[PDB]
Amino acid sequence: SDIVKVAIEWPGANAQLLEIDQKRPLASIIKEVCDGWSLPNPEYYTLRYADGPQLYITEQTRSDIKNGTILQLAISPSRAARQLMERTQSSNMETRLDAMKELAKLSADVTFATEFINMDGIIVLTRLVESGTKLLSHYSEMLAFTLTAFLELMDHGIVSWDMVSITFIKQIAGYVSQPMVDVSILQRSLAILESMVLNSQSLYQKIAEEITVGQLISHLQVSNQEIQTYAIALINALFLKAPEDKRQDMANAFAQKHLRSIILNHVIRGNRPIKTEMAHQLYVLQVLTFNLLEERMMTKMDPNDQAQRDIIFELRRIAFDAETEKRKAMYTKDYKMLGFTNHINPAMDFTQTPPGMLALDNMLYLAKVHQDTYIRIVLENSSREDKHECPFGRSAIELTKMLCEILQVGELPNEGRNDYHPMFFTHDRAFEELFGICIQLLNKTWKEMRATAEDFNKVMQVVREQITRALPSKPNSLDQFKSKLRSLSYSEILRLRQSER
Amino acid sequence: RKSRYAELDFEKIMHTRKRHQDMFQ
């Protein structure tokens, strides 16, 4: 009643065509097949798919066999695992190489892997890496197969990553930290370190000590996109696993060794088009990078802290002192003409989280790094006692909040996204630079709308539309982003809105 | 303080398994 038509093949023989009763034990089928070819000891054999990854057939997966499938009679997984336990440890180096090749093939099959793992097969591989001689020089091909088999076995999730010795860890890290070796070995070594880091806080700690920022970044400079992808993956893994209180230091260390420009020049603008898995790693890197802003975003100012109040005083001084009766008039209004809602105690405005102290950081950056722009914006609006001034303090806080929303500061990385904004790979302080560009935009839009204070939320909405219609054009640089914004003036936003209506 | 990343399925988010499969053909 429940039948599947298959052909079963064996080297040197003609196929047997069977109508397999799915109620019959596989052992009965295999004995039939063996008898057909005069093979003794049917219990030594099993069936596997002839095509694809050639998986072993079990009483489970036999249900998936489609009519007309070609199967092969093969050595059973248990006997194959025992044979490879012997041969991967042969003193005959050709025997060992051949065995490791076969082990790398079979280890992807969980039916085989469980047999091999249950004889401490993984320890055969780790002991070889720990103590084998001339592995990189004389036996690099064998070593690549060894590492392939190791990673395939570990990927079945049967045993904990914490089983690995400090000696094995150090050897794998050694392959990464060395003036680059074989590409196959480096690829697998990076892959193993990534998996170790992701799966164990203990392994993360040991690995973080064994590899330098410089060594990791150097691997981004190879022309091989898979090496580059695993290098960024390992970097991402270290960031993901780093304690909250160490992640910022790590970012500064990578930044000082030019991680960003190396990615820009060797990946983003590289000869080889970026394929999906590299794109995904660039997405994760950008998510982790924006999340470095999250703590400050959620930090409230302490309005009773004189040092923090003094930062706002400094901000005001930089602008107001660039302006004498006029200057006096500004200061008599406390912080009103710097545009804070809380005129007398602007520190209170920085207790809103988001954006909290991040907004203060952005303002101080603009004032220290782009003083002329800062002064222009404040002074065009600090003597304005018609209701048309653009309030700097209030605007900057709301803009910082808006940028955090747009760029999704605080969002976790997930499996489904591969998107990133390439212009953030073009400047060490791209977030702060973006703030400066967007506060100039906000002031331009404000003036284009002849806005008053009552219009504040409407202007912010236009500015939000401007920014978010510019980003999907994927500007290559901050300058390109600026050019794009110029093509989205208030009058253009009006036209686009009308076209929707 | 705890890590904001402590609770996620790191291999799944990182596509670790898929990348191995790509590498091992």
- CA radius of gyration of chain A is 32 Å
Mind telling me the C-alpha Rg of chain B?
A: 12 Å
Shape of chain A: elongated
Q: Terminal Cα separation of chain A, in Å?
A: 63 Å
User: Secondary-structure element order of chain B, as H and E?
Assistant: HH
Count of helices of chain A? 24
The number of distinct β-strands of chain B equals: 0
Which term fits the overall shape of chain B? rod-shaped
CATH H level of the domain at 80-298 in chain A: which superfamily?
Answer: Leucine-rich Repeat Variant
Question: In DSSP terms, counting alpha (H) and pi (I) runs of 4 or more, how many helices of chain B?
Answer: 2
The CATH top-level class label of the domain at 80-298 in chain A:
Mainly Alpha
Helix percentage of chain B = 40-55%
What letter string, H or E per element, gives the SSE order of chain A?
EEHEEHHHHHHHHHHHHHHHHHHHHHHH
Query: What proportion strand of chain B?
Result: under 5%
Name the strands of the widest sheet of chain A in spatial order: 2-1-4-3
Biased composition (Basic and acidic residues) (chain B): 1-14
Subcellular location (chain B): Cell membrane; Cell projection, Phagocytic cup; Cell junction, Focal adhesion; Cell projection, Dendritic spine
Protein name (chain B): Adhesion G protein-coupled receptor B1
Family (chain B): Belongs to the G-protein coupled receptor 2 family. LN-TM7 subfamily.
